[PDB]
Amino acid sequence: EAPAAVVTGAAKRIGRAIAVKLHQTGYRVVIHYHNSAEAAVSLADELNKERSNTAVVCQADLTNSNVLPASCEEIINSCFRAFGRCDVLVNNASAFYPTPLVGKTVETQVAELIGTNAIAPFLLTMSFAQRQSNLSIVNLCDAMVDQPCMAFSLYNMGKHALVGLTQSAALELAPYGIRVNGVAPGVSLLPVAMGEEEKDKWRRKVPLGRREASAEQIADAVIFLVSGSAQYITGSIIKVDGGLSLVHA
Amino acid sequence: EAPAAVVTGAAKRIGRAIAVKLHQTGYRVVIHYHNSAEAAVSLADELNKERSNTAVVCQADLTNSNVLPASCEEIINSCFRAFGRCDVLVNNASAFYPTPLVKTVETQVAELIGTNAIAPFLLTMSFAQRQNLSIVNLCDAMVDQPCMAFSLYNMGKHALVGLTQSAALELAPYGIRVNGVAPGVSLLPVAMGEEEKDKWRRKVPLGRREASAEQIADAVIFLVSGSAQYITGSIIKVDGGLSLVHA
Amino acid sequence: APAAVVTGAAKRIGRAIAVKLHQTGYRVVIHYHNSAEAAVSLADELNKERSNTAVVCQADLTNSNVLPASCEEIINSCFRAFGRCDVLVNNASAFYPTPLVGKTVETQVAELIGTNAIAPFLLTMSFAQRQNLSIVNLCDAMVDQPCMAFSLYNMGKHALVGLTQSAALELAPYGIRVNGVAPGVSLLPDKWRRKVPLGRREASAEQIADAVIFLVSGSAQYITGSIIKVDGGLSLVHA
Amino acid sequence: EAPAAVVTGAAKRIGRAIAVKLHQTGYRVVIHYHNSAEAAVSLADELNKERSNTAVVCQADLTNSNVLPASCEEIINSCFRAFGRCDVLVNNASAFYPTPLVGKTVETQVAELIGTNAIAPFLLTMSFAQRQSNLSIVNLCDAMVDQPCMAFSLYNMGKHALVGLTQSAALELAPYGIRVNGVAPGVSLLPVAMGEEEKDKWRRKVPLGRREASAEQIADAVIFLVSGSAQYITGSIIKVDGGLSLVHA
Ligand SMILES: NC(=O)c1ccc[n+]([C@@H]2O[C@H](COP(=O)([O-])OP(=O)(O)OC[C@H]3O[C@@H](n4cnc5c(N)ncnc54)[C@H](OP(=O)(O)O)[C@@H]3O)[C@@H](O)[C@H]2O)c1
Ligand SMILES: NC(=O)c1ccc[n+]([C@@H]2O[C@H](COP(=O)([O-])OP(=O)(O)OC[C@H]3O[C@@H](n4cnc5c(N)ncnc54)[C@H](OP(=O)(O)O)[C@@H]3O)[C@@H](O)[C@H]2O)c1
Ligand SMILES: NC(=O)c1ccc[n+]([C@@H]2O[C@H](COP(=O)([O-])OP(=O)(O)OC[C@H]3O[C@@H](n4cnc5c(N)ncnc54)[C@H](OP(=O)(O)O)[C@@H]3O)[C@@H](O)[C@H]2O)c1
Ligand SMILES: NC(=O)c1ccc[n+]([C@@H]2O[C@H](COP(=O)([O-])OP(=O)(O)OC[C@H]3O[C@@H](n4cnc5c(N)ncnc54)[C@H](OP(=O)(O)O)[C@@H]3O)[C@@H](O)[C@H]2O)c1
Ligand SMILES: Nc1nc(N)c2nc(-c3ccccc3)c(N)nc2n1
Ligand SMILES: Nc1nc(N)c2nc(-c3ccccc3)c(N)nc2n1
Ligand SMILES: Nc1nc(N)c2nc(-c3ccccc3)c(N)nc2n1
Ligand SMILES: Nc1nc(N)c2nc(-c3ccccc3)c(N)nc2n1
């Protein structure tokens, strides 16, 4: 019987590459999304054509609120309803935008950035654990948390909290055979918004090849961590940054 | 003119010692509290007896909510109203209790993440917007070796490390330094049996005792002083080597 | 076929690394200091699997005036035997207490800093100058929570972290990646077993080798200056 | 009686500032030096004119060799011979220059960079501890150890080892009441050989004031760590870098 995985924010970009690689490795997948309905359904279609009844979508807003625990429980439940098991949780979905110290209200910024990057991962990890082989969770972190982007405090706090979740959950869930690890991209797929000369500015910073990570390269590290080759690894965070975090100002 | 400091959760234990030591250094102080009104007022009266009109109290819940930003703005405002300036913010108030993975969970999130991280962020924003300026965040030396089943508390304290770094970077142009003090084992719970208190004390390499509140306060006093004028984004462990000790 | 140098490859973790590399399709230089019989025994086993794919190399890795020449010749042995050197695994390691309050202190320095840090530095330099190229340094997950009275050992492993970072930075333009694997408790030299969150047991050497294999692979092509803990959560556990 | 301190490489720059500040706080001092004999004696003359019999000089090479243990023993012994006690050791002396991976022999570079930055601190710590109130050791580290200068591998290895010494020595010496801490400057006093325009390049990188640390600012953090205000602090490293280590590439 095939194992099953939940990947949050899996309709596009890095989460999609993670979903695809998991599926190619033999997993059934829940493709979670928020706004990208067309891309999500398109992916599930691609994957089911490849193997029947192996992918479903699940729409959920991961902003912090009094019903976020219910939404997170429902995401996990959807995997069990579709596949009868849930072996892997990948916490990939993430809001990312500046929140200068000196538009959306600050209430909303806190709820979105801390919700998506930290609180939802915590609730999903809770629901995953309580619903329970090679069980594991992989959190998408950030290689640059100690050298943050200017004016991204709430985002950075969110990613720092996710490091703490990775460590605390690895410690507490180890007795249940659940491993909890992280993958920390540096510069990977760049914003569709961002201009090209600015893209090349970031690209030129990366020691290894003067280029951003492909989504597939980020996915490779996720696959390692969920695999039987990582069965003694828990509470570890693998940087996938081409040495970017090593470069001084 | 004497500088002014806001200390959150200053009615007792560590925040109290910090408020006392700031006051003794010559600061006027806003003693923030949540539930401990009598202790907060007792402290203000004691400090005002030392120097008239140098201490005020300020009640506020720092739990995350849609009123938290306004509450934080008012805390900072109260220092300006009382003393006409606000030179130092100390983020000390902190909820701390287990949240096992296996109060409603939404309340635990609001309290643990609100006090430890979001309120410090909102207070930092308000402090900066209103401008030897500095902020000191009370962290935790044991965040990479956390207590079992304290995930939300640990997340909040990591978030606070992130805030200290991000705010240090962003506020350095405005000449505001942002640092942390990270206790290991300090003031134990009042109700904790001495036998359990001794299990903790014996873990600490340096003197097999917990840090006094005054020892934690000493590091805060250093960071706000003219002797730390180039220090920003640094976190000082005050843990007697506890974090160095393997399982 | 690509070729790999594994230092201290005769026994234990270094042996598991060499075998797994060999199973992945590498030709391997099995380096040894004292364990000649074991090194040849491994070489024999690997050459029986595929002819002319494993050779041995003797060198003492203690710090000295001759360490640079020794490290140069280890790298050269790989080029001589296989005509290329794609992977360097710095696994060889001295391990023993050096209390702050038998061997002279200067010998303890030569072994604990020479084998753990200086030899990896000189092997790295030789590897880079002779050029999916990568180096993997065998680190220690307990570097920040060290064994009592192990200062020199801990110093050498910290220096090995510093080498991993500096070399990853400096050698990236050359397409040489440089990473580490940080075991917690693997092969002992029961108290420790019960401390480990994940299964209350030590890592097999094979579990360490798995992480090395990942890092040298096409699946780690963007990973440099990263250190992967393989410690079953041990470093997360407070005193 | 006044306490006594050994400061290594104390003839000029940051070591002098530390010895001066300790002397100003009331310590008697051993001004260790290697080549800077004139500057060392000049410093001692100034300090002794301030308070008679309160400063001595001590010449020693701190390069690694089979006699380094005897040299380190003698430095500590010089403090007991002059002052009857040794309360504080500041490991400040440090060789610093590039050793590219791709002049001096490599054996000499290793001996100098690893000897001065790591092995001598270890031997001095050993001697200090064995010769033995408020006892402590302060190690001069480097805030940039995780974002190192290109081509400084041996220097970087030395400072990492020094971080390890600080942690290991704090653990093992705590039972004896000896505290062990570090001060990690970012950019402080720039090289005498460095041209002004290159100095300004480094200055502009520092968020807090776009300027290097003064020697006094570094000395201030040392004075804190040796003081009664740091009585529970051990195994801590205080960055004094104006935010420099937080700035991404
Ligand atoms: N890209 C990089 O260079 C980089 C660098 C460092 C770290 N990372 C980390 O790696 C992971 C993947 O990065 P990425 O760039 O692929 O991410 P992304 O495109 O910015 O976001 C991934 C997905 O998160 C979902 N999301 C955003 N807000 C949400 C909300 N309120 N509720 C539920 N889902 C929400 C979105 O889903 P919908 O489209 O369906 O609305 C989005 O497609 C992220 O955790 C990120 O922080 C990326
Ligand atoms: N004690 C230790 O060993 C230790 C160890 C590591 C870190 N720390 C850190 O050091 C700091 C001080 O420690 P501590 O033990 O003295 O703290 P504490 O006694 O646990 O709490 C400090 C104050 O926090 C305030 N607080 C709690 N919940 C609040 C809420 N929802 N809204 C507003 N204020 C709230 C309380 O104020 P009221 O009493 O007025 O209700 C309380 O007196 C904390 O940041 C802590 O995490 C302490
Ligand atoms: N075992 C663990 O639980 C553990 C924990 C943390 C870190 N590690 C790291 O994992 C790696 C391998 O561990 P291990 O336990 O297998 O190592 P080990 O058994 O202690 O030694 C590995 C090999 O190092 C070589 N070696 C020692 N001194 C040498 C010298 N002076 N010159 C040349 N070679 C020398 C020896 O080769 P010869 O036999 O040929 O003389 C030895 O077989 C090491 O880097 C270690 O620090 C292991
Ligand atoms: N300057 C900075 O921006 C900076 C940045 C990061 C870290 N740091 C650290 O802060 C400390 C002070 O920096 P600094 O720039 O003042 O240092 P420095 O001038 O480069 O060196 C200080 C002293 O080290 C001594 N020294 C060098 N080689 C020696 C040897 N083989 N044996 C014995 N002593 C030797 C020299 O003594 P003699 O002159 O008598 O020959 C020199 O005066 C150092 O540990 C350094 O690594 C400094
Ligand atoms: N959720 C999430 N998190 C990020 N950290 C993130 N980062 C970038 C980015 C783009 C260029 C340079 C550096 C980062 C991005 N385009 N999207 C992102 N989305
Ligand atoms: N806000 C807050 N944060 C803490 N980290 C904290 N910790 C302890 C404590 C007691 C004994 C042993 C270890 C910790 C405590 N009694 N109160 C605390 N309050
Ligand atoms: N080279 C080397 N380096 C080590 N760090 C090492 N460590 C252990 C060990 C055993 C039990 C608990 C902790 C460590 C060991 N048996 N051999 C080792 N060999
Ligand atoms: N021993 C020692 N260690 C250093 N790290 C050091 N650093 C600088 C230097 C100045 C410009 C920017 C950064 C550092 C220096 N002039 N001397 C130094 N000496």
XYZ file of C-alpha atoms in Angstrom, chain B residues 5-23 29-33 39-40 43 47 90-94 136 138 183 186-187 212-218 220-221:
47
model
C 12.005 53.147 30.565
C 8.996 50.899 29.993
C 9.328 47.467 31.607
C 6.567 44.962 30.744
C 5.447 42.506 33.424
C 7.407 44.524 36.040
C 5.302 43.833 39.140
C 7.387 40.915 40.303
C 10.276 38.521 39.940
C 12.593 39.363 37.048
C 10.709 42.393 35.599
C 10.564 43.898 39.087
C 14.352 43.558 39.577
C 14.885 45.116 36.160
C 12.558 48.039 36.998
C 14.356 48.466 40.401
C 17.806 48.470 38.837
C 16.795 50.877 36.061
C 15.299 53.197 38.689
C 9.944 53.852 34.965
C 6.563 52.689 33.641
C 5.772 49.515 35.548
C 3.476 47.516 33.251
C 1.394 44.696 34.762
C 2.489 44.260 43.552
C 2.798 46.844 40.715
C 6.679 48.840 43.657
C 10.284 53.875 43.975
C 12.238 46.112 28.113
C 10.083 43.229 26.804
C 9.892 41.051 29.840
C 6.203 39.971 30.222
C 5.754 36.365 29.241
C 16.034 44.743 25.479
C 13.990 38.777 27.578
C 18.276 33.515 31.238
C 16.473 31.822 37.071
C 13.577 32.349 39.521
C 18.849 35.723 40.877
C 16.558 38.273 39.247
C 19.266 40.842 40.028
C 21.824 38.923 37.947
C 19.454 38.973 34.963
C 18.826 42.687 35.610
C 22.606 43.348 35.609
C 19.879 44.430 31.003
C 21.555 47.415 32.732
